[PDB]
Design a protein around this ligand. Sequence first.
Ligand SMILES: O=C(O)c1ccccc1NC[C@H](O)[C@H](O)[C@H](O)COP(=O)(O)O
Length: 194
Amino acid sequence: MVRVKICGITNLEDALFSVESGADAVGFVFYPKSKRYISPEDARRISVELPPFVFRVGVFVNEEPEKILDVASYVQLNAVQLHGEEPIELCRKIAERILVIKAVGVSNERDMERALNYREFPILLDTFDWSLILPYRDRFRYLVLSGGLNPENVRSAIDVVRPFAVDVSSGVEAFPGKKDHDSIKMFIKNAKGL
Ligand SMILES: O=C(O)c1ccccc1NC[C@H](O)[C@H](O)[C@H](O)COP(=O)(O)O
């Protein structure tokens, strides 16, 4: 069964609702220019109140390795999602202390060729024509499918690719920073086949 991550959480109530509905991970965007931005302190409060067995991920965009490590131990993250243009070295350094997921934007097979350079880490493909990923699926360990996913389309995207996980943030929102519980229920209901 596919895993589901709900990203850009900015408040407790949305996070908890996510957990109770079946979400396997919850994410916080530590990129200052995002509308879904949340401060380490506010994130800490949420992190700390969540049950175990639910991953806490932090999204960073071209941040310097030390800041990544500090936010991570402070907020008690379980993984780090490197969503910029980070070189494998930075990736490899971060990975010595905590698990990293590398995000890579994709729109044509040239992009999939760039992604293969990071195949040693789990990949989040930020994408749509799912089938163009197919000839590359087995070159990767674990693949997180993302981009434009919503309750209406997740199942189709899951049938074509069969990924480890699926990620979403605006496709289940009422507005930037605030989730819509019915959409979350439906997104998880549909993606997992419950
Ligand atoms: O959500 C944001 O604003 C944001 C900004 C900068 C970096 C990452 C961000 N989101 C983190 C996560 O990887 C995103 O959910 C997906 O790329 C967005 O999928 P969407 O729901 O917009 O299709």
